[PDB]
Structure formats: structure tokens, C-alpha cells
Design a protein around this nucleic acid. Structure first.
Lengths: 115, 115
DNA sequence: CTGGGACCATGGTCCCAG
DNA sequence: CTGGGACCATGGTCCCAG
């Protein structure tokens, strides 16, 4: 099963050109809900760094990828930072699975840091 | 007492005009250690928004303004973004207070902290 | 057209209790 | 050990409202 990130790349191009950016058009073409295209496409927007955090790109579900991207909209730099920070954890040997990555990543946006 | 940020602005001007980039010159003028000028100036270099995180600009110490500035040098976007974040949180009713603010901003750079 | 909300069955994990 | 209940996130679909 190709990764959400991957699908998103394809969906992305097919939109810009093959369908004049008509999500609905592409959807029918791919014979799949529009949301699915949205979710994956937004995932493909995530920084290459953030993708790397996962062993296998398939570990980043379209659903979480989508939410991640929306969450860090207009804050790509913050995202990139967090991403690197986590990269050092594993660099220093630390290990956390998929489900955690998104959490730790998103953490910076949550107040539970101090409260 | 005029806040560091304020002093910073005034200093930087005289520095750019009345004394053509010569800290020592300005220092002699204001009759205060060069360090002070440096601290305030860097403080005035902080994004309006970052200053805005505090009720009164006076809440931002020259000392912190300085460290904050140096800390995020060549990372102004990151700072602005992280400032937004903290702005949205207190927008959602969260409450911070001076000391906590500067610490929160800086947390982003810390591998241990952010993750 | 488009995004978002309400839903859905599924593969799958945990863990309790015979 | 073994089955079953309680959950869970996911991929998806529908369909409403801007």
C-alpha cells in the first residue's frame, strides 16, 4: 500500500495540470471521495523532514498527516523546528513510534507544556 | 521607567545618526556602560508581536530582550511563528506572565524542552 | 466547486475472565 | 491458554452549507 504521502504527490500534480486544480474533477477521475484527495494532498505538503521522522512513510496516515498540516498552517518554520528537535532525540538513540511523533510534534502548539 | 524596548528604539536612532554606528560614542553620551546600550538595542530588534505578548513592554527586561534576540538571530521567522502560537493560546484564554513568556518562546530551540 | 461534520466497518490492540 | 468486551485510528462515504 503506497503511503498517503506518496498518493498526495500524484494527486497534487494531477491537479495542477491534468485537472486545472479541480478537486472534484480529480476525485471523480480517481473514483474516490474528495476528502481522501484533500487529506493525502495536504499530507504531501508536510516538510520532507517531518516525513523522515517515520521509519516508513506509510507510517504517516493521511488522516494524521492532514491534521498535522492544517495544525501548522502558517507556522511551517515552527513545524520544521519541532521536526529537527525530534530528529535529535532519535539521533541520540531515543525511540518513539508513529503515534507519538505526531503528538510530540503537535505538542508545541498545546498549552499542557506549562499547564 | 521607560521600558528596555523603548530605550532600545531611542538608542538605535542616536546610534544611527548622532554617532554613526559607534556604540562607545553613544555610550559616552548616555553615560552608561556599552553593554546596556547593546542589550536595549537588541531588545528593540524584537518583533512587535513578541513584545506584544506582555501586558506592558516594561515587562520585558533588557536582559531577556537581549538574550531572546541573540537566541533567535537568523531565525526571525521561527520567533514570529512561535510568538503567534503563544498569542493564540492566550487568545484561547490561557494566561502567561513575563518570566513564563520568554521561557516559552525559547523552549522551541531546546531539544529536551520542545520534545 | 469546496471544506467540514456525522457516520461507518475494519484491522487491530488490550486486557478481563473463565 | 482462550474467547470476548472495550476501545481505537484509519480509510472511506454522505451530504450539508457556504
Amino acid at each position: 500500500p503506497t503511503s498517503a504521502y506518496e498518493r498526495g504527490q500524484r494527486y497534487a500534480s494531477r491537479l495542477q495540470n491534468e485537472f486545472a486544480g479541480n478537486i472534484s474533477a480529480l476525485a471523480d477521475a480517481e473514483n474516490i471521495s474528495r476528502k481522501i484527495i484533500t487529506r493525502c494532498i495536504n499530507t504531501a505538503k508536510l516538510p520532507k523532514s517531518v516525513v523522515a521522522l517515520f521509519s516508513h512513510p506509510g507510517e504517516l496516515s493521511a488522516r494524521s498527516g492532514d491534521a498535522l498540516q492544517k495544525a501548522f498552517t502558517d507556522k511551517e518554520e515552527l513545524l520544521k523546528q519541532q521536526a529537527s528537535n525530534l530528529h535529535e532525540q532519535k539521533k541520540a538513540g531515543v525511540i518513539f513510534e508513529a503515534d507519538e511523533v505526531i503528538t510530540l510534534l503537535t505538542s508545541v502548539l498545546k498549552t499542557s507544556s506549562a499547564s
